[PDB]
């Protein structure tokens, strides 16, 4: 009696896209520190999923010492950047410049370990089993992209949509392909999270017209 | 020869909808004396289309002395905030501050009342025989969605819809799927509502698709 | 060897359209006279289509006395306004206004005949024989009410429209269901036909997906 | 072991768009050198590919005889504006008006010669074997036509869409039938390309819901 329904590696896939996301944070302009470190306790929530998921990886023992080694080498992942940068202002505090260095290319690092797991659970996520249950999982892919938008935004200054539940709002306008126009990225990732959810609304039409098609058979009983 | 059409169960569910609205009304900003009661002139007239469907709940007789009692439960709808605001300023005139909360107390339970009263008339009408019907139905719910907006917001400031007929045309062009832009409710409820509109004019084109696909198999005739 | 292609037909529900568009045209605002007899000259070019018509109507000879009858009762539909307002001037230069009033109680005339002429038109129409014909019916529909807008827009002030060519594209816009936003009527029937050229955008979608349903079953093959 | 993978013809239409595109771009208003000759840069681009498609015309040798010969008739569109109008520069710095018109004439009938070589990778990317191969096919003429519209506009003033990627941006929009509404051509052959891109959106979907209906057919398995 463990994590292991559909919505379980729904919420799988949903962690490991809010990794990535986590990975787009990090690299970013000079911004407000209250934010900055609201975003890194979202992080930190985030990789307490990571820790959940990961011990689902075992079976909560080290037994699985084969997949423990390979665990370190998504470990990185888990590696969290709430600690990471305050590690850093220590050592800035210290003096160590080439240090530094180090550490920027650890965060390149724990940057492709986190996309190499997004690979892993994408794929994962491709091995379900029902695609009845996509009815469900396009909704959840919509709504996370709506989380995902308000995380690189509603900090984000100037984007006009500093409010919170208007992501749901543009989210759905997208998902609806309405297009308002009062309310868009206007910033380059926020643009190419808008390529997702744009063809993410596209499959939600498509998951709709298969919907019809299913339901004119149906009509046909 | 009584009220008994499918149009009859659909404008049930209609006023059924409406009196969500006027719930909606109830709790509101501080607002202009003149529409606010051009509100309440409209929602007198819905609890008239109460009456009707509550007499037609019984046989009009109240032999049915089981379903009276359960109407005791939903009378609540039943009762007329005209009425309700009314005796509420009386009561001010005398000075009774825990009276009016206990009105409050009594206009969240008709909420209640009315809420559960749409569950009722919208479980019916999913209990509706002909989904040929939807062909109407929907163009009615439509139209339904429209005078709702226009319930919400042709009283509310600043949202630049005051006009009535406007109405209509924003909302053909959600239905329609357009977003012609200089047309929004820029509120909150009023975007609740337009995530309503918004899933209505997708049902809108999964019926005309489903009429697609129809029209395709019989052009093969 | 005469008019009768699909064609032929499809040009007749035009002209009918058409005649609706000037019977629209002729009631207005205080108008600029030089584009108001601009309309004027584009409506007796409809007059002479109605000249073309009524003659196919019968067979180029008088012997059909009986529908020339009921030809009567339509051929204030052929009667000139272009014609008819410079009577009107003449009889203002006499200055008989009870007689004016009787030229607009015959305006009002022409106007219900036009219209069941129109009613006509569509009945035939609808009783043509080829459903796969719709295909080029349909983007004839399009450009047809792309030249409607045009004219109720195009001399109408303040429209921003008042270039031609882009009556043409915020038509494709419409019928693309883009809605691009810097171009919309803003006027009442203007979004009259902005209803109409809507659910034709519809119908062209629909169009579409039959053509998808067509192109499918034959990639079968 | 040549290019004659499906994607060969693919490239091969994409470079007869591209050289419409040229001569779309070959007469226009009075411009900034630079970004003039920046087009000429990409213009002889092409025209390498117009060496490379022509070569391919024949089996590298000139024993097709024949075939050189309608060369002849399609090697103006292998003649580079990049060399045609530094000549004209050239004869200016000589004082030749007539050769300049005759020069002129040279450009008409070089639009002409490229104008048929789309014709012909048109028909005979219309005689390609696989529809299911239409899955990229769509997809390559979006990306195309996005390149187009950079192609147009990026140097074109005013456009508010002088950043790059913003052309993938607006394309996807497009194709995806949004709307954004803030970037849109608002210049005639921009709007033009417009008419194209909102088509191919079109038969995008199309496309969609063809998958649509295998994916149902084949959830039913």
Redesign the interface.
């Known amino acids: 009696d463990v994590m292991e329904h559909p919505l379980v590696e729904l919420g799988v896939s949903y962690a490991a896209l809010l990794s990535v996301i986590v990975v787009v944070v990090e690299y970013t302009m000079q911004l407000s520190g209250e934010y900055l470190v609201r975003l890194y306790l979202v992080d930190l929530i985030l990789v307490i999923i990571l820790w959940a998921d990961y011990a689902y990886r075992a079976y909560k023992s080290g037994d699985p010492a084969g997949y423990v080694k390979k665990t370190l080498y998504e470990i990185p992942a888990l590696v969290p950047a709430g600690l990471l940068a305050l590690i850093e202002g220590h050592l800035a505090g210290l003096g160590l410049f080439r240090l530094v260095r180090l550490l920027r290319f650890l965060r390149i690092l724990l940057i492709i370990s986190r996309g190499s797991k997004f690979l892993s659970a994408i794929a994962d996520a491709a091995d379900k089993i029902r695609?009845?249950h996509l009815f469900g999982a396009v909704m959840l892919t919509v709504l996370y992209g709506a989380f995902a938008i308000y995380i690189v935004e509603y900090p984000d200054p100037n984007s006009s949509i500093k409010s919170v539940?208007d992501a749901l709002?543009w989210a759905?306008?997208?998902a609806?392909?309405?297009?308002?126009?009062?309310v868009?990225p206007?910033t380059?990732i926020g643009?190419v999270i808008?390529?997702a959810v744009?063809?993410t609304?596209?499959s939600a039409?498509?998951l709709?017209?298969?919907?019809?098609?299913?339901?004119?058979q149906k009509?046909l009983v």
Do not use: E, Q, R
Request: proline share 3%.
């Open positions: 695609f009845y539940f709002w759905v306008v997208t609806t392909t309405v297009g308002y126009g009062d868009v206007a380059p643009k808008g390529i744009m063809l609304g596209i039409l498509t709709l017209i298969g919907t019809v098609s299913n339901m004119f009509i």
